[PDB]
Amino acid sequence: MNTLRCLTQALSKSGREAPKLYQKVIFPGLFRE
Amino acid sequence: STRYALEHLKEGAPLKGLFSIEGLQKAWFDRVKYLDAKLNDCTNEAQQKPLETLIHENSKSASKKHIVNYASSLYNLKFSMSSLQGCIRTPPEECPRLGPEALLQTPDFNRTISNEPLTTGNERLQAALISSFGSLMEFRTLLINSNLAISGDGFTWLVARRQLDKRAMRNDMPNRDIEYDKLFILNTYNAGTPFNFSTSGVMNELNNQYTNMEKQRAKEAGNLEDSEMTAKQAKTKFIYETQQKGFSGKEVSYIPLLAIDASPKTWLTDYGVFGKREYLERVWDSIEWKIVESRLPQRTKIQAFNTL
Amino acid sequence: RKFLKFSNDEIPPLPDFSKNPQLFENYIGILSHTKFNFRSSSKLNGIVRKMLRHLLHPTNKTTLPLRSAQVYNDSIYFFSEHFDFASCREIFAQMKAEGTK
Amino acid sequence: LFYKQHPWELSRPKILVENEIGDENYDWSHMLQIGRPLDGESVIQRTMYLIKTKQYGDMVEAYDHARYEFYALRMQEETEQQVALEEAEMFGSLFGVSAIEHGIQK
Amino acid sequence: TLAELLGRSRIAQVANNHKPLTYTGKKFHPTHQIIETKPSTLYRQEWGLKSAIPSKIKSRYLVYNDLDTLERITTFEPRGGTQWNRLRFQEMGVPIVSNIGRQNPFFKYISRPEDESHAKLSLFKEMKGDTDISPAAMKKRLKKITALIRSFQDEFKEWLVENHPDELKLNSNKLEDYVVKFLNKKLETKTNKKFNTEIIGTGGLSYSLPGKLKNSPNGVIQRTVVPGRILNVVKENNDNKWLAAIGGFVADVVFFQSPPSSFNSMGDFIRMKTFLFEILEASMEKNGSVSMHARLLEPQNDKTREFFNKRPIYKPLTSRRARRPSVGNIQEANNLLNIIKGN
Amino acid sequence: QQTKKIDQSLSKKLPKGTIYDPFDFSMGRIHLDRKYQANKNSNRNDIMKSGANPLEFYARPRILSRYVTSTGRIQHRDITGLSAKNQRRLSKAIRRCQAIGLM
Amino acid sequence: SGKPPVYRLPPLPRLKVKKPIIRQEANKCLVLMSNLLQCWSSYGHMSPKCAGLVTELKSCTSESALGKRNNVQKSNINYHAARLYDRINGKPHD
Amino acid sequence: SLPISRKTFYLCIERLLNEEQLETASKLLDYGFQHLKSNFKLDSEAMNHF
C-alpha cells in the first residue's frame, strides 16, 4: 500500500528528463536485387 | 543620371547631418555621372534592360567584364545610398574635423543602441534581427566593425538566405517565390555581387577545364598521370564542391536588404581619414527602416511555420 | 533500431562480402529477429543456426576483424529467445576471448 | 581575478623586457595607449583611473566598466584581422603555410 | 615612488601562479602566461626575468612560476603553444554559440532587473562560499552570516508587521517568501556586489559574433572543411561518436552513415592518416571546456549510392499532430475511470 | 598489412574537449604521465581528509577497510597521506574496531 | 597535510650514484634462441615448423655468439650531479 | 501522470478480462483504437487474449 506513495514521492523528487531517441522503419527486402 | 535618381537626394543640397553640398555632390552625383558615362561608352546597347538583369545575363567572361564592373559598381552605390534619410546631428561643414585622438577613442557599441526599427514599428524586422544575430547590439557592432575593417572600396550587406526549392527552374510561382531562411552579414569588394547563384563555382569550373587541358597535353606528349595528378586535384575539387555545397537544389541565393559604403571617396571629403568611425555611426543613425522592412521577404512558411 | 516481426518466405540470398562487407551486419541483425513460418529454419534443427555458425566458426579466412559487437549481441538475443542458456554462455565466452570490449 | 576570469588571455604572449619605463605618458580616460599593447594591464589601469578620479564607487563597478570597454576593443581587433585576411585572399594573396597545416606537419 | 613604479612594472603584471608546470590531468584552457623574447634579447639570453635563461633554450617563448628558488634556478618551461591553438581556432572561424545561456556576456543588458528565479537557492550558495570544510569552514562562514542576520533581526520584524500582518495572522508560506525577498534586497545592498571568478564567455578564446559569412572567390563559403585526425579507431564505448583531433581541440565526430574501410584497414594505427572534417557547431561548458561537433567527409565520388543501409540520425518525434492533444492522462484517466464504471 | 591490434599501455586516449599539443602523441607523454601518476581521485573522495573525525568511524568496518592492507595491516603515513593527528586517530579507531570484533 | 612533505639532506661531501643503471637494449639473437627452444618444447623436439627460427639463429650465431657490438652505453648523471650539487643543495650562505 | 503505452494497455485489458466484462472490454478496445493514434496499438496479441 506504501508502494504508490513511495513511487509518487520518487517522481516528485526526480526529474522527468525526456531522452532523445533515433528510429526509423527497416525492411528485409532492401537487399534483394 | 535621370534613370538613377532618387527622391531623397537633390542637386546642390546637403543631407541632414551626413553630407555637405560639396560632400553630397562629390560622393553621389560625380560618381553616378562618371559611371553612366563609362558604362554607356562601353558596349551596352541593351541599355533599356535593368541593371540586375544585365549583371545576371552578362558575367563569367573576361572579354565582357568591364560591363559587369561598372554596372555592379553603380548598383552597389545605388542600393547603399538608397537607405539613407538623414540624422539629427550637426552638419559636417559646421562640425569640427577630427584628429589622431579618434583612433584612441573607445567605441560604445557594447553599451548603447539607437535607431531601433521597433520605434518606427517594424516588429517583424526586429524579431528577424533578434532571432538572427541575437541582439541589436550584436548586429550594430558587427556592421560597424566589418565596415570599418574593410579597407579598399567595398560594401557591407544585410543579406537574407533564400533556399531554392527542388525544381527545374520553373518561373512564375507567386506567393512562394521570396522565402528566406536566416539573415546574415556579408562583405563585397570593388564589384562583388551578393547573390552567389551566378557566382558560385567559377574557380571550380576554371580548374576543371585546366585539368582537362593538362590531361590533353599529357596524352599528346605521351605522359603518364602521377599520384598527385590523381589525388591532389581530386581533393581540391572535393573541397571546392563541399564548401560550395549549400543545398542540393541550386544551392542557396542571397537577397539584399541593406548596404553601407566603405569607399574613401564617400566619406573622406567631409570626415577626413580619422572620421570613418563617425561617418559609419551617422550612417547607422540615418537608416530609414521602412525601406529595409519592405525589402525583407517572407519567411519560409513551408515546414517552418508548418512545424509538421 | 526498428526490425520486422516475422516473414513467411525462404531465407534471403546471401550477398557477397569480400568487396562489400557492410551488408553482413544488417543481414545477420534482421535474421536474428526474423521468425520464418515457411521453412521453420529458425528452430534448433533449422538451417539458420548452421548458416550463421558456418560463418562465425572460422572468423573468415584471413579478414578476422571484419566483425563487430552487434553480431554477437544479436546472436545472444536469438539464442536467448530460443531458450539456449548454454548457447548464450558460449557466445559470451568466445566474444570476450576475441578481445572485443 | 582578470586572468582567472579569462584564462585564454594568458595565451596572448607578453614581452617582459622593459624599455624606458620612465617615458610613458598615459591618459587613462581611454584604454588605447600609444606604445603599449591591449592587455589586462590596460583594464587594471583603467579601473584605478576610474577609482582615483571618483566616477564610480566600489571597485567592481570600475572593473566592470573597464572590461566592457575591453570586450569592444577586442571585438574590433579580431574583426579587422578576419576582414583583412579575406580581402587579401579576394585580391589574390597566396599563403605557403597556414597554422592548421603547420600543426599537421609537426 | 619606487614602489609605485614597481606596481606598474611588467614583472608585476603577471598574476601570481604556482600551479604545476608539469601536469598530466585533463587540460581545458591555459594555465600560465606566455613570456616571449625578441631575437636580439634571446641572442643575449635576456627574457626580462631575474635570471638569464641558459643558452640551449633556442625557443623565443616560455612559461614560469618563480623568479628564483632556493635551488638557484628559475622554474620555467621552454613551451607555449596555446597561442597556436587559439590561432588555429581562429582559422577554423566557427563562432561560439551561447546555447541555453542567453545574453552574451561581452555585452551589457537591462534584463537583470528581471530577476525572479528561486533566489533562495542562490543566496544559500553565496552563504556557503567556503565550500572546503563542512564542520569548520562553512561552519564559521555560517556563524558570520548568523551574526549579521541576528543584527538585522529587528528591522525585518517591523517591516513585516507593518506591511503584511495578514500573512502573519493567517500563518501562510507568503511569510517565508517575504523572508527570502527581504534578505534578497539586503543582499542587493552595498558590500554585496561581490567579485565572481566564474568563467565568463569564451574566456578570451575568441571574440566572434554568430552571423557573418566567409567570402571566397568561388562564392560565399557555405561549409568549413578543415583537416583532422581520428584518435580511436572505434567510437567511444556505449557512444555512437568518435573523437577527432582538429586544430588542437578534440571534437566529437559523427559519421556519414558508414565508417570508411580505411578504419578497418588501418586498425589502431588510424592516427597516422589525416582526414577532412566539417564543424557543425562549437559550444562551451561550465568547466571552461570547448565542445565542438564535427562530421567526417569521405568522398563518395565514383562510389556506390550507399544503398542497403539504415538511417542512424533520424527523429521519430515528428508527431506534433500527436502533441496537439493533451496526452497527459488528465482527461484520459477520466475516460478510463468512466470505462471502469462501465461506460 | 602487419600486426593490427595493440594494448592500451602505450596509446594515449585523449579526452573529448581537452586541448592538446603535438607533443602529446610522442612516446614521451606516456613516460611523463606514468611518472607523475598521482591519485587525486582519492584526494577528492577520501572522507578522512574531508575533515571528519576518524575516531567517529569505529563502527564502520567498511569505511575503515579502505585504509588497511588485504591482511589487515595499517598503511604507513607515507602511503595514506593523512596528517599525523588523523593517522593516529584512524589507527586508534581501527585497533578499537578490532577489539570489539566488528572488523 | 596539503601535499607530501619534502625531505632535506644534510651537507654531503658528494652527490654520487654508486652504480648507474642503463636502459640496455634487448638482443635479438638470444631472443631467437629462446623462442626456438620454446618452439621445440611446445611442438616437440626439432619442430618442422620452426626450421625458419633455426635458420635465423644459425645466421645470428654464425660469427661471434653475442652478435655485434657498436658501443657500450653508460650514464653521465655522476658528472651532472658533481657539477650541480653545490648550486642546488640550498646550503646556508657561507 | 505518465502517458499510456501499448504494453500498458495490453496489461490492463488482460487484467480486466479476468473478471469477464465483455461489454466493458469491447468499449475499452474501441476507445483505445479511436484514441492513441500515434501509439502503435491494436496488436494481434490483444485479439489473441480474447
Full 3-state SS string of chain E: CHHHHHHHCHHHHCCCCCCCCCCCCCCCCCCCCCEECCHHHHHCCCCCCCCCCCCCCCCCEEEEEECCCCCCCCEEECCCCHHHHHHHHHHHCCCCCCCCCCCCCCCCCCCCCCCCCCHHHHHHHHHCCCCCCCCCHHHHHHHHHHHHHHHHHHHHHHHHHHHCHHHHHHCCCHHHHHHHHHHHHHHHCCCCCCCCCCCCCCCCCCCCCCCECCEECCEECCCCEEEEEECCCCCCCCCCCEEEEECCEEEEEECCCCCCHHHHHHHHHHHHCCEEEEEEEEEECCCCCEEEEEEECCCCCCCCCCCCCCCCCCCCCCCHHHHCCCCCCCCHHHHHHHHHHCC
Amino acid in position B305: F
User: What does each C-alpha distance from E244 to B304, E233, F20 come to in angstroms?
Assistant: 33, 10, 11
Contact B188, B76 (CB under 8 A): yes
Q: Report CB contact under 8 Å: E217, B203.
A: yes
D54 SS3 class: coil
DSSP state of B98: P
**Residue A24: closest CA among chain C residues belongs to which residue?**
C2
For residue E255, what is its C-alpha cell?
Answer: 559519421
DSSP state of G79: H
F-chain residues near G4 (CB < 8 A): 78, 81
**Cα–Cα distance for residue pair G51/E212, rounded to 1 Å:** 70
**Cα–Cα distance for residue pair B109/C10, rounded to 1 Å:** 73
Exposure class string for B146-167: b at 16+ Cβ within 10 A, else e: bbbbbeebbbbbbbbbbbeeee
**Cα–Cα distance for residue pair D69/E73, rounded to 1 Å:** 40
Q: What angle do helix axes H22-34 and H6-17 make, rounded to 10 degrees?
A: 170
**Any chain F CB within 8 A of the CB of C62?**
no
For residue F26, what is its C-alpha cell?
Answer: 610522442
Adjacent-strand bridge partners of E290: E284
G-chain residues near E70 (CB < 8 A): 90
Q: What angle do CA E288, E289, E295 make, to 5 degrees?
A: 150
**Residue C2: closest CA among chain E residues belongs to which residue?**
E310
**Cα–Cα distance for residue pair B267/E148, rounded to 1 Å:** 61
Cβ contact F–A (≥3 pairs, < 8 Å): no
Nearest Cα of chain E lies from the Cα of F72 at a distance, in angstroms, of 30
Task: Give the total residue count for chain H.
Answer: 50
Tell me the count of B-E CB pairs closer than 8 A.
Answer: 93
For residue F13, what is its C-alpha cell?
Answer: 586516449
**Residue C70: closest CA among chain E residues belongs to which residue?**
E238
Amino acid in position B83: S
* Header resolution in angstroms: 3.0
Neighbours of F5 (CB within 10 A): 9
Of E98, E212, E222, the CB nearest to B185: E212
Q: Report CB contact under 8 Å: B151, D91.
A: no
Q: What angle do CA E69, E74, E75 make, to 5 degrees?
A: 90
C-chain residues near A33 (CB < 8 A): none
Q: Which structural domain range is residue F59 located in?
A: 46-102
Of B103, B110, B150, the CB nearest to D83: B150
Adjacent-strand bridge partners of E249: E246, F19
**Residue E253: closest CA among chain F residues belongs to which residue?**
F16
For cell 643558452, what's the residue? E55
Q: Report CB contact under 8 Å: E73, G90.
A: no
Q: Is the dihedral of CA B93, B94, B99, B103 positive or negative?
A: negative
**Cα–Cα distance for residue pair E11/D18, rounded to 1 Å:** 9
- Neighbouring chains of D at 3+ CB pairs under 8 Å are B, E
The contact set of F with C (CB < 8 A) is 4-5
**Cα–Cα distance for residue pair E329/H2, rounded to 1 Å:** 7
- The pairs formed by E121-128 with CB atoms below 8 angstroms and a separation of 24 or more are E123/E180, E123/E183, E123/E184, E123/E187, E126/E187, E126/E194
Q: Is the dihedral of CA B12, B18, B24, B28 positive or negative?
A: negative
Give me the DSSP letters along B198-251: TTTTHHHHHHHHHHHHHHHHHHHHT----HHHHHHHHHHHHHHHHHT-S-TTT-
User: What does each C-alpha distance from F86 to C34, F48, F62, F81 come to in angstroms?
Assistant: 64, 7, 18, 10
Exposure class string for F72-102: b at 16+ Cβ within 10 A, else e: eebeebeebbbeeebbebbbebbeebeeeee
Nearest Cα of chain D lies from the Cα of B15 at a distance, in angstroms, of 29
**Cα–Cα distance for residue pair C44/C59, rounded to 1 Å:** 22
Of F4, F20, F51, the CB nearest to E133: F51
**Cα–Cα distance for residue pair B105/B98, rounded to 1 Å:** 11
Phi first, then psi, for residue D75 (nearest 5°) are: -60, -50
Contact B107, D76 (CB under 8 A): yes
User: What does each C-alpha distance from B37 to B25, B153, E52, E270 come to in angstroms?
Assistant: 16, 20, 69, 63
**Residue C1: closest CA among chain A residues belongs to which residue?**
A23
For residue C10, what is its C-alpha cell?
Answer: 525462404
Contact D38, D74 (CB under 8 A): yes
DSSP state of B169: -
For residue C79, what is its C-alpha cell?
Answer: 539464442
User: What does each C-alpha distance from B302 to A2, B130, B163, B165, B176 come to in angstroms?
Assistant: 52, 21, 11, 10, 9
B294 SS3 class: helix
For residue D30, what is its C-alpha cell?
Answer: 581611454
Amino acid in position B253: S
**Cα–Cα distance for residue pair G57/G48, rounded to 1 Å:** 15
**Cα–Cα distance for residue pair B8/B126, rounded to 1 Å:** 25
Helix H or strand E encompassing B187: strand B179-189
Q: Report CB contact under 8 Å: F49, G1.
A: yes
The structure was resolved experimentally with: cryo-EM
Adjacent-strand bridge partners of E250: E245
Contact D10, E207 (CB under 8 A): no
Neighbours of G54 (CB within 10 A): 16
B277 SS3 class: helix
User: What does each C-alpha distance from E277 to E87, E141, E216 come to in angstroms?
Assistant: 18, 51, 19
Q: Is the dihedral of CA F83, F88, F90, F91 positive or negative?
A: positive
**Cα–Cα distance for residue pair F23/E82, rounded to 1 Å:** 13
For residue B119, what is its C-alpha cell?
Answer: 520605434
The contact set of E with G (CB < 8 A) is 70-73
N-terminal to C-terminal alpha carbon distance within chain B: 51
**Cα–Cα distance for residue pair B7/B15, rounded to 1 Å:** 12
**Cα–Cα distance for residue pair B186/E211, rounded to 1 Å:** 9
Q: Report CB contact under 8 Å: C66, E258.
A: no
B299 SS3 class: strand
For cell 526509423, what's the residue? A24
Phi first, then psi, for residue B297 (nearest 5°) are: -80, 165
Q: Is the dihedral of CA B130, B132, B136, B137 positive or negative?
A: positive
Q: Report CB contact under 8 Å: F4, C99.
A: no
- Neighbouring chains of C at 3+ CB pairs under 8 Å are A, E, F
Rg (chain H; Cα; Å): 10
**Any chain E CB within 8 A of the CB of D96?**
no
Q: How many angstroms from the chain centroid is the CA of residue B190?
A: 10
Amino acid in position E72: R
**Cα–Cα distance for residue pair E7/D21, rounded to 1 Å:** 12
Helix H or strand E encompassing D49: helix D40-52
Of E328, E330, E335, the CB nearest to H31: E335
Phi first, then psi, for residue E296 (nearest 5°) are: -75, 145
B-chain residues near E299 (CB < 8 A): 234, 238
Q: Report CB contact under 8 Å: D32, B142.
A: no
For residue D69, what is its C-alpha cell?
Answer: 570597454
Q: Report CB contact under 8 Å: E310, C26.
A: yes
**Cα–Cα distance for residue pair E305/E297, rounded to 1 Å:** 15
Residues 6+ apart with CB under 8 A from B115: B284, B285, B287, B289
- The pairs formed by E67-70 with CB atoms below 8 angstroms and a separation of 24 or more are E67/E11, E70/G90
**Cα–Cα distance for residue pair E44/E50, rounded to 1 Å:** 14
**Any chain E CB within 8 A of the CB of G87?**
yes
Contact B139, E109 (CB under 8 A): no
Q: Report CB contact under 8 Å: F18, E245.
A: no
